[PDB]
């Protein structure tokens, strides 16, 4: 399943200089090993994948709490948006690129 | 706008078995997380399911896991609840609720249906 | 599970009077508390929703303040659309859980 918990965010997102942002987040909840709801999107109404991802298939291994993980993601060229997470506790952040 | 029908509600002897339905018109079902709720007569609400819409995730109140089944389908835009093991505190009224948000958990519910009765007896 | 508690349960007031009403957790929730409306043999009417923002639709004299474990919503004039029971939600942890609902009655 999905980690339907909230994240918090312990950097903001990073350039590495390859063309591709990194972002680490930590998990609150400990509901098991889940997959990490991360996408990249062209606006906040179309949740359309539009950027590609980078770091295959983000997890959370453990099934312990505040387990942080190391997500890399490769947004489009212009305006963008980084969501993680869902429902009303769904945290976006608008990214530029080059 | 937004019209949820709820059907299904009846009569069923304790122990027995009963599905609900819920078709919905006026907002992509298929991209909006829906909910079951039941409201005693004369009492306060009460969440018993919700799902994703994607059907990727479902989540049960205490008194209903392992009894309850919560389902949908997106091309018929109709929500379901088959219910099992029904005891007489299970007589209620069951609402079919909206999301707020697309691609939701079903944390809150925007619109409600009229509700259909379900009674537990003998 | 957070356990929602209205207080009153019960108030009568008069068309224009401003009322508030109090709906409080056991733990703490940040801002994730919604509001609903429900009139007798009526489906509940979502009315706000993080404690302060109101729904869209929803008259402006409704609004809602507090945070953490203390929550009031406010009608700041009471009119005959009004008057019904309110229910108050979390949206905290899995369980969603309501209050015990809090009846607005006409004082005459």
């Known amino acids: 399943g999905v980690c339907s918990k909230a994240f918090k965010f312990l950097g903001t997102p990073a350039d590495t200089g390859h063309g591709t942002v990194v972002l680490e987040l930590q998990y609150t909840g400990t509901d098991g090993p889940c997959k990490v709801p991360i996408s990249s999107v062209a606006s906040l109404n179309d949740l359309t994948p539009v950027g590609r991802l980078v770091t295959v298939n983000p997890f959370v291994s453990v099934a312990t709490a505040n387990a942080k993980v190391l997500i890399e993601l490769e947004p489009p060229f212009g305006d963008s948006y980084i969501v993680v997470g869902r429902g009303e506790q769904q945290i976006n952040h608008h990214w530029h690129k080059s | 706008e937004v019209q949820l029908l709820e059907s299904g509600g009846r009569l069923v002897q304790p122990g027995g078995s009963l599905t609900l339905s819920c078709a919905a018109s006026?907002?992509?079902?298929?991209?909006?997380?829906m909910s079951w709720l039941r409201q005693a007569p004369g009492k306060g609400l009460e969440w018993v399911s919700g799902?994703?819409?994607?059907?990727?995730?479902?989540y049960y109140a205490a008194s209903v896991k392992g009894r309850f089944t919560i389902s949908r389908d997106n091309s018929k835009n109709t929500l379901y609840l088959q219910m099992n093991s029904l005891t007489a505190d299970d007589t209620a009224v069951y609402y079919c609720?909206?999301?707020?948000?697309?691609?939701?958990?079903?944390?809150?519910?925007?619109?409600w249906g009229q509700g259909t009765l379900v009674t537990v007896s003998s | 599970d957070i356990q929602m508690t209205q207080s009153p349960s019960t108030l009568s007031a008069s068309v224009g009077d401003r009322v508030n009403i109090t709906c409080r957790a056991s733990?703490?929730?940040?801002?994730?508390l919604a509001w609903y409306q429900q009139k007798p043999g009526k489906a509940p009417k979502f009315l706000m929703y993080?404690?302060?923002t109101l729904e869209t639709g929803v008259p402006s004299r409704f609004s809602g303040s507090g945070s953490g474990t203390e929550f009031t919503l406010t009608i700041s004039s009471l009119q005959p659309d009004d008057f019904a029971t309110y229910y108050c939600?979390?949206?905290?942890?899995?369980?969603?859980?309501f209050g015990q609902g809090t009846k607005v009655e006409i004082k005459r």
């Open positions: 609720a909206k999301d707020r948000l697309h691609s939701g958990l079903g944390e809150l519910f925007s619109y």
């Open positions: 799902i994703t819409g994607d059907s990727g995730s479902t």
């Open positions: 733990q703490s929730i940040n801002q994730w």
């Open positions: 939600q979390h949206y905290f942890s899995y369980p969603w859980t």
């Open positions: 993080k404690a302060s």
């Open positions: 006026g907002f992509p079902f298929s991209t909006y997380a």
